[PDB]
Amino acid sequence: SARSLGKGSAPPGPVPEGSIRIYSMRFCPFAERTRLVLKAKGIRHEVININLKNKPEWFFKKNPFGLVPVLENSQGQLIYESAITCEYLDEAYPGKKLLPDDPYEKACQKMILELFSKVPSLVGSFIRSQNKEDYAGLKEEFRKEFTKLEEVLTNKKTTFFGGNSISMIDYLIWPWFERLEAMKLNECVDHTPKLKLWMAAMKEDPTVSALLTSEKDWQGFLELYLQNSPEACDYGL
Amino acid sequence: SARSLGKGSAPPGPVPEGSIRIYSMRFCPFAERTRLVLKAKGIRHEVININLKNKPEWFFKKNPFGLVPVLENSQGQLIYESAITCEYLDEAYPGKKLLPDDPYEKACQKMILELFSKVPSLVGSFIRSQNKEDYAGLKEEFRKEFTKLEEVLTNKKTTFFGGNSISMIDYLIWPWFERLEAMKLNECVDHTPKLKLWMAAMKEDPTVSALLTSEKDWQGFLELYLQNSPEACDYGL
Ligand SMILES: *CC(=O)Nc1ccc(Cl)c(S(=O)(=O)N(C)C)c1
Ligand SMILES: *CC(=O)Nc1ccc(Cl)c(S(=O)(=O)N(C)C)c1
Protein backbone atom coordinates (compact mmCIF):
# COMPACT_ATOMS: atom_id res chain seq x y z
CA SER A 1 0.00 0.00 0.00
CA ALA A 2 2.98 2.33 0.82
CA ARG A 3 4.29 1.23 -2.67
CA SER A 4 5.17 4.14 -5.03
CA LEU A 5 2.82 5.13 -7.91
CA GLY A 6 4.37 5.33 -11.40
CA LYS A 7 3.51 5.34 -15.15
CA GLY A 8 0.19 3.62 -15.87
CA SER A 9 -1.27 4.40 -12.43
CA ALA A 10 -4.59 6.23 -12.04
CA PRO A 11 -5.07 9.74 -10.48
CA PRO A 12 -5.74 9.53 -6.68
CA GLY A 13 -9.11 11.33 -6.73
CA PRO A 14 -10.40 13.88 -4.15
CA VAL A 15 -8.80 14.33 -0.69
CA PRO A 16 -11.48 13.70 2.04
CA GLU A 17 -12.61 16.32 4.61
CA GLY A 18 -10.58 16.49 7.83
CA SER A 19 -7.38 15.21 6.18
CA ILE A 20 -4.52 16.60 4.06
CA ARG A 21 -2.57 14.57 1.45
CA ILE A 22 1.21 14.50 1.01
CA TYR A 23 2.77 13.26 -2.27
CA SER A 24 6.06 11.94 -0.90
CA MET A 25 8.94 9.42 -1.44
CA ARG A 26 10.14 7.50 1.66
CA PHE A 27 13.85 8.24 0.95
CA CYS A 28 13.49 11.86 -0.15
CA PRO A 29 15.19 14.19 2.44
CA PHE A 30 13.22 17.26 1.12
CA ALA A 31 9.85 15.45 1.56
CA GLU A 32 11.08 14.22 5.01
CA ARG A 33 10.88 17.89 6.22
CA THR A 34 7.05 17.91 5.54
CA ARG A 35 6.57 14.50 7.17
CA LEU A 36 8.55 15.69 10.26
CA VAL A 37 6.19 18.70 10.53
CA LEU A 38 2.99 16.59 9.94
CA LYS A 39 4.11 14.19 12.73
CA ALA A 40 5.32 16.96 15.15
CA LYS A 41 2.00 18.90 14.80
CA GLY A 42 -0.01 15.60 14.90
CA ILE A 43 -1.83 16.42 11.61
CA ARG A 44 -4.22 13.74 10.22
CA HIS A 45 -2.92 12.92 6.73
CA GLU A 46 -2.68 10.37 3.89
CA VAL A 47 0.64 9.53 2.18
CA ILE A 48 1.00 8.72 -1.54
CA ASN A 49 4.50 7.76 -2.59
CA ILE A 50 5.74 8.78 -6.07
CA ASN A 51 8.18 6.65 -8.11
CA LEU A 52 10.61 9.45 -9.00
CA LYS A 53 12.48 7.29 -11.62
CA ASN A 54 9.16 6.46 -13.44
CA LYS A 55 6.75 9.35 -12.60
CA PRO A 56 2.97 9.21 -13.34
CA GLU A 57 1.57 11.53 -16.04
CA TRP A 58 -1.00 13.02 -13.56
CA PHE A 59 1.80 14.03 -11.09
CA PHE A 60 2.75 17.09 -13.23
CA LYS A 61 -0.83 18.45 -12.59
CA LYS A 62 -0.01 18.39 -8.82
CA ASN A 63 3.34 20.23 -9.36
CA PRO A 64 4.71 21.64 -12.69
CA PHE A 65 8.27 20.95 -11.34
CA GLY A 66 7.26 17.25 -10.89
CA LEU A 67 8.91 16.99 -7.45
CA VAL A 68 7.96 15.66 -3.99
CA PRO A 69 6.81 16.95 -1.45
CA VAL A 70 3.39 18.24 -2.57
CA LEU A 71 0.40 18.95 -0.26
CA GLU A 72 -3.26 18.66 -1.39
CA ASN A 73 -6.21 19.53 0.85
CA SER A 74 -10.02 18.79 0.64
CA GLN A 75 -10.72 22.07 -1.29
CA GLY A 76 -8.16 20.91 -3.94
CA GLN A 77 -5.47 23.55 -3.10
CA LEU A 78 -1.94 22.45 -4.04
CA ILE A 79 1.22 23.52 -2.13
CA TYR A 80 4.75 22.55 -3.26
CA GLU A 81 8.42 23.37 -2.23
CA SER A 82 9.45 21.57 0.98
CA ALA A 83 10.03 24.84 2.99
CA ILE A 84 6.69 26.31 1.72
CA THR A 85 4.73 23.09 2.65
CA CYS A 86 6.27 23.25 6.17
CA GLU A 87 5.40 26.95 6.73
CA TYR A 88 1.86 26.30 5.37
CA LEU A 89 1.35 23.37 7.84
CA ASP A 90 2.48 25.50 10.80
CA GLU A 91 0.06 28.37 9.91
CA ALA A 92 -3.03 26.34 8.74
CA TYR A 93 -3.06 23.82 11.65
CA PRO A 94 -3.30 24.28 15.46
CA GLY A 95 -1.05 23.23 18.36
CA LYS A 96 2.54 24.09 19.35
CA LYS A 97 3.94 26.50 16.70
CA LEU A 98 7.20 25.26 15.09
CA LEU A 99 7.93 28.78 13.74
CA PRO A 100 8.16 31.57 16.36
CA ASP A 101 5.68 34.50 16.33
CA ASP A 102 8.54 37.11 16.62
CA PRO A 103 9.31 38.59 13.14
CA TYR A 104 13.07 38.77 13.86
CA GLU A 105 13.20 35.17 15.28
CA LYS A 106 11.19 34.06 12.20
CA ALA A 107 13.71 35.92 9.90
CA CYS A 108 16.68 34.30 11.77
CA GLN A 109 15.39 30.77 11.10
CA LYS A 110 15.07 31.65 7.37
CA MET A 111 18.64 33.17 7.45
CA ILE A 112 20.06 29.92 9.00
CA LEU A 113 18.25 27.93 6.22
CA GLU A 114 20.13 30.10 3.65
CA LEU A 115 23.48 29.37 5.46
CA PHE A 116 22.77 25.63 4.94
CA SER A 117 21.75 26.15 1.23
CA LYS A 118 24.92 24.55 -0.33
CA VAL A 119 24.84 21.27 1.78
CA PRO A 120 22.25 19.24 -0.36
CA SER A 121 24.21 19.89 -3.63
CA LEU A 122 27.42 18.86 -1.78
CA VAL A 123 25.75 15.59 -0.55
CA GLY A 124 24.77 15.05 -4.24
CA SER A 125 28.36 15.56 -5.47
CA PHE A 126 29.74 13.15 -2.83
CA ILE A 127 27.21 10.45 -3.84
CA ARG A 128 27.87 10.79 -7.63
CA SER A 129 31.66 10.15 -7.50
CA GLN A 130 34.10 8.57 -10.03
CA ASN A 131 37.35 8.63 -7.92
CA LYS A 132 38.61 8.65 -4.27
CA GLU A 133 40.82 11.75 -4.95
CA ASP A 134 37.75 14.13 -5.04
CA TYR A 135 36.63 12.82 -1.57
CA ALA A 136 39.14 14.89 0.52
CA GLY A 137 38.30 18.11 -1.44
CA LEU A 138 34.54 17.65 -1.01
CA LYS A 139 35.09 16.93 2.73
CA GLU A 140 36.83 20.33 3.02
CA GLU A 141 33.84 21.89 1.09
CA PHE A 142 31.55 20.31 3.77
CA ARG A 143 33.70 21.71 6.67
CA LYS A 144 33.57 25.24 5.06
CA GLU A 145 29.71 25.07 5.04
CA PHE A 146 29.36 23.27 8.47
CA THR A 147 31.52 26.07 10.03
CA LYS A 148 28.75 28.57 8.99
CA LEU A 149 26.25 26.57 11.12
CA GLU A 150 28.75 26.32 14.05
CA GLU A 151 29.15 30.16 14.25
CA VAL A 152 25.28 30.47 14.64
CA LEU A 153 25.13 27.97 17.59
CA THR A 154 28.24 29.67 19.17
CA ASN A 155 26.71 33.21 18.91
CA LYS A 156 23.19 32.14 20.09
CA LYS A 157 24.70 30.16 23.08
CA THR A 158 21.75 27.67 22.64
CA THR A 159 21.39 23.86 21.98
CA PHE A 160 19.10 24.15 18.87
CA PHE A 161 19.21 26.66 15.96
CA GLY A 162 15.93 28.30 17.13
CA GLY A 163 16.40 28.24 20.92
CA ASN A 164 16.69 25.90 23.95
CA SER A 165 13.82 23.74 22.54
CA ILE A 166 13.48 22.21 19.00
CA SER A 167 11.75 24.32 16.26
CA MET A 168 11.11 24.46 12.43
CA ILE A 169 14.76 25.18 11.37
CA ASP A 170 16.04 22.00 13.14
CA TYR A 171 13.50 19.80 11.24
CA LEU A 172 14.33 21.60 7.93
CA ILE A 173 18.10 20.95 8.08
CA TRP A 174 18.02 17.52 9.92
CA PRO A 175 17.41 15.04 6.93
CA TRP A 176 20.91 15.75 5.51
CA PHE A 177 22.63 15.33 8.93
CA GLU A 178 20.61 12.06 9.36
CA ARG A 179 22.37 10.55 6.28
CA LEU A 180 26.01 11.69 7.16
CA GLU A 181 26.85 8.47 9.12
CA ALA A 182 25.47 6.12 6.37
CA MET A 183 27.63 8.02 3.81
CA LYS A 184 30.70 7.82 6.20
CA LEU A 185 31.01 11.66 6.49
CA ASN A 186 31.02 11.95 10.38
CA GLU A 187 34.63 13.35 10.24
CA CYS A 188 33.29 16.55 8.48
CA VAL A 189 31.88 17.73 11.87
CA ASP A 190 35.17 17.10 13.86
CA HIS A 191 35.92 20.90 13.80
CA THR A 192 32.31 21.89 14.79
CA PRO A 193 31.70 20.59 18.40
CA LYS A 194 28.42 22.50 19.05
CA LEU A 195 27.08 21.14 15.64
CA LYS A 196 28.14 17.53 16.61
CA LEU A 197 26.35 17.83 20.02
CA TRP A 198 23.27 19.21 18.14
CA MET A 199 23.06 15.92 16.08
CA ALA A 200 23.03 13.61 19.17
CA ALA A 201 20.45 15.93 20.85
CA MET A 202 18.33 15.78 17.62
CA LYS A 203 18.53 11.91 17.44
CA GLU A 204 16.81 11.81 20.89
CA ASP A 205 13.78 13.98 19.78
CA PRO A 206 10.70 11.61 19.67
CA THR A 207 9.56 13.12 16.31
CA VAL A 208 13.07 12.67 14.71
CA SER A 209 13.55 9.16 16.25
CA ALA A 210 10.13 7.90 14.93
CA LEU A 211 10.81 8.91 11.28
CA LEU A 212 14.54 7.95 11.24
CA THR A 213 15.44 5.52 8.39
CA SER A 214 18.17 2.89 8.98
CA GLU A 215 21.81 3.01 7.73
CA LYS A 216 21.35 -0.09 5.53
CA ASP A 217 17.98 1.15 4.13
CA TRP A 218 19.65 4.40 2.95
CA GLN A 219 22.66 2.39 1.58
CA GLY A 220 20.24 -0.01 -0.18
CA PHE A 221 18.17 2.83 -1.71
CA LEU A 222 21.26 4.82 -2.85
CA GLU A 223 22.73 1.65 -4.45
CA LEU A 224 19.52 1.25 -6.57
CA TYR A 225 19.44 5.06 -7.14
CA LEU A 226 23.05 5.02 -8.55
CA GLN A 227 21.80 2.17 -10.84
CA ASN A 228 18.84 4.45 -11.82
CA SER A 229 16.48 1.53 -10.87
CA PRO A 230 12.67 2.07 -10.83
CA GLU A 231 12.64 -0.13 -7.64
CA ALA A 232 14.87 2.36 -5.69
CA CYS A 233 11.88 4.31 -4.29
CA ASP A 234 10.34 0.92 -3.20
CA TYR A 235 13.49 -0.52 -1.49
CA GLY A 236 12.68 -2.46 1.71
CA LEU A 237 9.19 -3.82 0.72
CA SER B 1 25.52 62.14 1.02
CA ALA B 2 23.80 59.31 -0.99
CA ARG B 3 27.41 58.47 -2.14
CA SER B 4 28.44 54.81 -1.57
CA LEU B 5 30.77 53.83 1.33
CA GLY B 6 33.88 51.78 0.44
CA LYS B 7 37.35 50.74 1.73
CA GLY B 8 38.74 53.22 4.26
CA SER B 9 35.30 54.38 5.44
CA ALA B 10 34.30 54.26 9.11
CA PRO B 11 31.52 52.03 10.62
CA PRO B 12 28.11 53.86 10.67
CA GLY B 13 27.53 53.62 14.43
CA PRO B 14 24.19 52.90 16.21
CA VAL B 15 20.79 53.16 14.44
CA PRO B 16 18.58 55.72 16.33
CA GLU B 17 15.22 54.88 17.98
CA GLY B 18 12.14 55.13 15.74
CA SER B 19 14.09 54.37 12.55
CA ILE B 20 15.44 51.31 10.69
CA ARG B 21 18.60 51.33 8.50
CA ILE B 22 18.95 49.76 5.05
CA TYR B 23 22.42 49.01 3.59
CA SER B 24 21.60 49.36 -0.10
CA MET B 25 23.01 50.18 -3.60
CA ARG B 26 20.87 52.47 -5.82
CA PHE B 27 21.16 50.15 -8.87
CA CYS B 28 20.79 46.82 -7.08
CA PRO B 29 17.46 45.13 -8.13
CA PHE B 30 17.54 42.82 -5.03
CA ALA B 31 17.89 45.82 -2.64
CA GLU B 32 15.17 47.64 -4.68
CA ARG B 33 12.64 45.05 -3.31
CA THR B 34 13.33 46.26 0.31
CA ARG B 35 13.16 49.93 -0.71
CA LEU B 36 9.82 49.28 -2.51
CA VAL B 37 8.45 47.74 0.73
CA LEU B 38 9.88 50.56 2.99
CA LYS B 39 8.21 53.18 0.71
CA ALA B 40 4.88 51.24 0.28
CA LYS B 41 4.52 50.76 4.10
CA GLY B 42 5.74 54.36 4.73
CA ILE B 43 8.50 53.18 7.15
CA ARG B 44 10.87 55.87 8.56
CA HIS B 45 14.38 54.78 7.53
CA GLU B 46 17.97 55.81 6.75
CA VAL B 47 19.81 54.62 3.60
CA ILE B 48 23.55 53.81 3.48
CA ASN B 49 24.81 52.88 0.04
CA ILE B 50 27.60 50.28 -0.27
CA ASN B 51 30.25 50.38 -3.03
CA LEU B 52 29.94 46.76 -4.13
CA LYS B 53 33.15 46.90 -6.30
CA ASN B 54 35.22 48.22 -3.30
CA LYS B 55 33.38 47.02 -0.13
CA PRO B 56 34.19 48.33 3.39
CA GLU B 57 35.81 45.92 5.89
CA TRP B 58 33.00 46.56 8.48
CA PHE B 59 30.27 45.53 5.93
CA PHE B 60 31.04 41.78 6.46
CA LYS B 61 30.00 42.25 10.16
CA LYS B 62 26.53 43.35 8.90
CA ASN B 63 26.24 40.30 6.55
CA PRO B 64 28.74 37.37 6.24
CA PHE B 65 27.69 37.07 2.53
CA GLY B 66 28.73 40.76 2.05
CA LEU B 67 25.63 41.59 -0.02
CA VAL B 68 22.97 44.34 -0.08
CA PRO B 69 20.16 44.62 1.10
CA VAL B 70 20.76 44.45 4.88
CA LEU B 71 18.42 45.84 7.59
CA GLU B 72 19.65 47.09 11.00
CA ASN B 73 17.30 48.32 13.74
CA SER B 74 17.86 50.34 17.01
CA GLN B 75 18.39 47.13 19.11
CA GLY B 76 21.23 46.15 16.68
CA GLN B 77 19.38 43.19 15.05
CA LEU B 78 20.59 42.41 11.51
CA ILE B 79 18.35 40.98 8.74
CA TYR B 80 19.70 40.02 5.28
CA GLU B 81 18.35 38.28 2.06
CA SER B 82 16.07 40.58 0.03
CA ALA B 83 12.94 38.31 0.43
CA ILE B 84 13.61 37.89 4.20
CA THR B 85 14.04 41.72 4.72
CA CYS B 86 10.70 42.27 2.89
CA GLU B 87 8.77 39.67 4.97
CA TYR B 88 10.35 41.10 8.17
CA LEU B 89 9.22 44.68 7.25
CA ASP B 90 5.64 43.52 6.59
CA GLU B 91 5.40 41.71 9.98
CA ALA B 92 7.33 44.19 12.25
CA TYR B 93 5.63 47.39 10.97
CA PRO B 94 1.94 48.49 10.86
CA GLY B 95 -0.37 49.56 8.01
CA LYS B 96 -1.69 47.81 4.89
CA LYS B 97 -0.21 44.26 4.83
CA LEU B 98 1.69 43.46 1.59
CA LEU B 99 1.55 39.70 2.37
CA PRO B 100 -1.95 38.20 2.83
CA ASP B 101 -3.01 36.67 6.19
CA ASP B 102 -4.35 33.47 4.47
CA PRO B 103 -1.73 30.64 4.75
CA TYR B 104 -2.53 29.30 1.26
CA GLU B 105 -2.45 32.81 -0.36
CA LYS B 106 0.86 33.41 1.50
CA ALA B 107 2.20 30.02 0.16
CA CYS B 108 1.05 30.93 -3.42
CA GLN B 109 3.06 34.17 -3.43
CA LYS B 110 6.16 32.19 -2.32
CA MET B 111 5.43 29.55 -5.06
CA ILE B 112 5.23 32.32 -7.77
CA LEU B 113 8.59 33.69 -6.45
CA GLU B 114 10.09 30.19 -7.06
CA LEU B 115 8.64 30.17 -10.65
CA PHE B 116 10.58 33.42 -11.29
CA SER B 117 13.81 32.02 -9.66
CA LYS B 118 15.81 31.58 -12.97
CA VAL B 119 15.14 35.16 -14.37
CA PRO B 120 17.94 37.11 -12.44
CA SER B 121 20.67 34.60 -13.57
CA LEU B 122 19.29 34.91 -17.15
CA VAL B 123 19.46 38.78 -16.97
CA GLY B 124 23.09 38.26 -15.77
CA SER B 125 23.95 35.99 -18.74
CA PHE B 126 22.42 38.46 -21.23
CA ILE B 127 24.46 41.36 -19.75
CA ARG B 128 27.80 39.43 -19.74
CA SER B 129 27.85 38.56 -23.48
CA GLN B 130 30.74 38.02 -25.97
CA ASN B 131 28.71 37.49 -29.22
CA LYS B 132 25.31 38.31 -30.86
CA GLU B 133 24.69 34.59 -31.67
CA ASP B 134 23.92 33.73 -27.97
CA TYR B 135 21.24 36.53 -27.87
CA ALA B 136 18.46 34.57 -29.70
CA GLY B 137 19.04 31.46 -27.51
CA LEU B 138 18.91 33.45 -24.26
CA LYS B 139 15.73 35.22 -25.53
CA GLU B 140 14.10 31.77 -25.93
CA GLU B 141 15.34 30.89 -22.35
CA PHE B 142 13.53 34.10 -21.17
CA ARG B 143 10.27 33.14 -23.02
CA LYS B 144 10.39 29.62 -21.40
CA GLU B 145 10.55 31.24 -17.91
CA PHE B 146 8.10 34.15 -18.70
CA THR B 147 5.53 31.52 -19.87
CA LYS B 148 5.58 30.10 -16.27
CA LEU B 149 4.44 33.53 -14.98
CA GLU B 150 1.78 33.85 -17.75
CA GLU B 151 0.11 30.50 -16.75
CA VAL B 152 -0.29 31.88 -13.13
CA LEU B 153 -2.05 35.13 -14.29
CA THR B 154 -4.22 33.07 -16.74
CA ASN B 155 -5.32 30.56 -14.01
CA LYS B 156 -5.92 33.26 -11.31
CA LYS B 157 -7.94 35.44 -13.82
CA THR B 158 -6.51 38.54 -11.95
CA THR B 159 -4.42 41.66 -12.92
CA PHE B 160 -1.62 41.17 -10.29
CA PHE B 161 0.08 37.94 -9.09
CA GLY B 162 -1.56 38.25 -5.63
CA GLY B 163 -5.03 39.50 -6.58
CA ASN B 164 -6.93 42.47 -8.10
CA SER B 165 -4.73 44.90 -6.06
CA ILE B 166 -0.87 45.04 -5.83
CA SER B 167 0.88 42.92 -3.10
CA MET B 168 4.36 41.66 -1.96
CA ILE B 169 4.99 39.24 -4.92
CA ASP B 170 4.56 42.09 -7.50
CA TYR B 171 7.21 44.24 -5.71
CA LEU B 172 9.56 41.19 -5.37
CA ILE B 173 9.59 40.34 -9.11
CA TRP B 174 9.22 43.94 -10.52
CA PRO B 175 12.95 45.19 -10.47
CA TRP B 176 13.91 42.71 -13.24
CA PHE B 177 10.88 43.65 -15.44
CA GLU B 178 11.80 47.36 -14.83
CA ARG B 179 15.18 46.84 -16.59
CA LEU B 180 13.86 44.78 -19.64
CA GLU B 181 13.28 47.90 -21.85
CA ALA B 182 16.75 49.41 -21.08
CA MET B 183 18.33 46.04 -22.04
CA LYS B 184 16.14 45.90 -25.25
CA LEU B 185 14.38 42.63 -24.18
CA ASN B 186 10.68 43.79 -24.60
CA GLU B 187 10.20 41.16 -27.40
CA CYS B 188 10.61 38.33 -24.76
CA VAL B 189 7.06 39.11 -23.48
CA ASP B 190 5.39 39.10 -27.01
CA HIS B 191 3.97 35.56 -26.31
CA THR B 192 2.75 36.48 -22.75
CA PRO B 193 -0.07 39.13 -23.14
CA LYS B 194 -1.33 39.03 -19.50
CA LEU B 195 2.35 39.45 -18.31
CA LYS B 196 2.84 42.45 -20.73
CA LEU B 197 -0.38 44.14 -19.43
CA TRP B 198 0.88 43.47 -15.84
CA MET B 199 4.06 45.59 -16.57
CA ALA B 200 2.11 48.69 -17.79
CA ALA B 201 -0.29 48.33 -14.79
CA MET B 202 2.79 48.10 -12.46
CA LYS B 203 4.45 51.23 -14.03
CA GLU B 204 1.34 53.24 -12.94
CA ASP B 205 1.59 52.18 -9.21
CA PRO B 206 2.67 55.33 -7.22
CA THR B 207 5.21 53.27 -5.17
CA VAL B 208 6.78 51.71 -8.36
CA SER B 209 6.71 55.06 -10.29
CA ALA B 210 8.49 56.97 -7.42
CA LEU B 211 11.45 54.52 -7.19
CA LEU B 212 11.78 53.87 -10.98
CA THR B 213 15.33 54.55 -12.32
CA SER B 214 15.75 55.94 -15.87
CA GLU B 215 16.77 53.96 -19.02
CA LYS B 216 20.01 55.97 -19.43
CA ASP B 217 20.89 55.71 -15.69
CA TRP B 218 20.69 51.89 -15.89
CA GLN B 219 22.67 51.92 -19.21
CA GLY B 220 25.27 54.25 -17.63
CA PHE B 221 25.63 52.09 -14.47
CA LEU B 222 25.84 48.79 -16.45
CA GLU B 223 28.51 50.32 -18.74
CA LEU B 224 30.69 51.13 -15.66
CA TYR B 225 29.74 47.73 -14.12
CA LEU B 226 30.98 45.85 -17.27
CA GLN B 227 34.22 47.92 -16.85
CA ASN B 228 34.30 46.77 -13.17
CA SER B 229 34.61 50.51 -12.18
CA PRO B 230 34.44 51.54 -8.48
CA GLU B 231 32.35 54.57 -9.67
CA ALA B 232 29.55 52.32 -11.08
CA CYS B 233 27.56 52.33 -7.80
CA ASP B 234 27.90 56.20 -7.76
CA TYR B 235 26.81 56.82 -11.41
CA GLY B 236 24.63 59.93 -11.80
CA LEU B 237 26.14 62.09 -8.94
C1 LIG C 1 13.35 13.98 -3.03
C2 LIG C 1 14.78 13.85 -3.52
O3 LIG C 1 15.26 14.69 -4.27
N4 LIG C 1 15.45 12.78 -3.05
C5 LIG C 1 16.85 12.59 -3.01
C6 LIG C 1 17.37 11.31 -3.18
C7 LIG C 1 18.73 11.09 -3.06
C8 LIG C 1 19.59 12.13 -2.76
CL9 LIG C 1 21.28 11.78 -2.62
C10 LIG C 1 19.09 13.43 -2.60
S11 LIG C 1 20.15 14.81 -2.26
O12 LIG C 1 19.41 15.81 -1.55
O13 LIG C 1 21.38 14.33 -1.72
N14 LIG C 1 20.49 15.41 -3.73
C15 LIG C 1 19.41 16.14 -4.42
C16 LIG C 1 21.29 14.58 -4.63
C17 LIG C 1 17.72 13.64 -2.73
C1 LIG D 1 22.63 44.03 -5.80
C2 LIG D 1 23.10 43.41 -7.09
O3 LIG D 1 23.46 42.23 -7.13
N4 LIG D 1 23.07 44.23 -8.17
C5 LIG D 1 23.07 43.86 -9.54
C6 LIG D 1 23.72 44.68 -10.45
C7 LIG D 1 23.66 44.39 -11.80
C8 LIG D 1 22.96 43.28 -12.25
CL9 LIG D 1 22.93 42.98 -13.96
C10 LIG D 1 22.32 42.43 -11.34
S11 LIG D 1 21.45 40.97 -11.87
O12 LIG D 1 20.43 40.67 -10.91
O13 LIG D 1 21.11 41.10 -13.25
N14 LIG D 1 22.57 39.80 -11.76
C15 LIG D 1 22.94 39.35 -10.41
C16 LIG D 1 23.70 39.86 -12.69
C17 LIG D 1 22.39 42.74 -9.99
Q: Which of A83, A90, A39, A79 is nearest to A172 (CA)?
A: A83
CA angle B154/B160/B165 to nearest 5° reads 135
Q: What is the domain-level CATH number for residue B190?
A: 1.20.1050.10
Q: What is the DSSP string of A38-57?
A: HHHTT--EEEEEB-TTS--T
Q: What is the domain-level CATH number for residue A50?
A: 3.40.30.10
What experimental approach yielded this model? X-ray
* Distance from the alpha carbon of residue A194 to the mean position of ligand 2, in angstroms: 36
Cβ(A128) – ligand 1 distance below 6 Å:
no
Pair A135, A229 in one domain: no
Q: Which of A80, A88, A111 sits opposite B84 (nearest CB)?
A: A111
Cβ(B29) – ligand 2 distance below 6 Å:
yes
CA angle A51/A53/A59 to nearest 5° reads 50
* Distance from the alpha carbon of residue A15 to the mean position of ligand 2, in angstroms: 43
Pair B134, B149 in one domain: yes
Pair B90, B5 in one domain: yes
Instruction: With beta carbons less than 8 A apart as the criterion, state whether A88 and A71 touch.
Output: yes
A101 touches B at CB < 8 Å: no
Pair B1, B17 in one domain: yes
Pair B93, B123 in one domain: no
Distance between CA B34 and CA B83 in Å, rounded?
A: 8
Q: Which of A87, A103, A148 sits opposite B88 (nearest CB)?
A: A103
Distance between CA A53 and CA A235 in Å, rounded?
A: 13
Q: Which of B163, B17, B172, B15 is nearest to B90 (CA)?
A: B172
In 3-state terms, what secondary structure has residue A178?
helix
Q: Find chain A residues with C-beta within 8 A of B88's C-beta.
A: 103-104, 106-107
* Distance from the alpha carbon of residue B28 to the mean position of ligand 2, in angstroms: 6
Instruction: Domain count for chain A, please give it.
Output: 2
Distance between CA A168 and CA A37 in Å, rounded?
A: 8
Expressed as residue numbers, the domain containing B127 is 99-213
What phi and psi, each to the nearest 5 degrees, are found at residue A42?
Answer: 55, 40
Pocket test for ligand 2, best of B23, B27, B59 (most atoms within 8 A of CB): B27
Pair A193, A117 in one domain: yes
Distance between CA B112 and CA A179 in Å, rounded?
A: 31
- Known catalytic membership, residue A28: yes
Pair B60, B125 in one domain: no
Angle between helices B168-178 and B193-203 (to 10 degrees): 100
Pair B237, B143 in one domain: no
Q: What share of chain A is helix, strand, coil (3-state, %, to 5)?
A: 50, 10, 40
Cβ(B124) – ligand 2 distance below 6 Å:
yes
Pair A109, A62 in one domain: no
The answer to whether the CB atoms of B111 and A77 lie below 8 A apart is no
Give A150→chain B minimum CA distance, Å. Answer: 14
Q: Which of A91, A110, A148 sits opposite B103 (nearest CB)?
A: A91
Q: How far is CA A236 from CA A1, A7, A223, in A?
A: 13, 21, 12
B92 touches A at CB < 8 Å: yes
Pair B157, B234 in one domain: no
Strand extents, DSSP E, chain A:
20-24, 45-49, 70-72, 78-80
A81 touches B at CB < 8 Å: yes
* Distance from the alpha carbon of residue B225 to the mean position of ligand 2, in angstroms: 10
Q: Which residue owns the Cα nearest ligand 1 atom 17?
A: A28
Pair A87, A38 in one domain: yes
Pair A196, A133 in one domain: yes
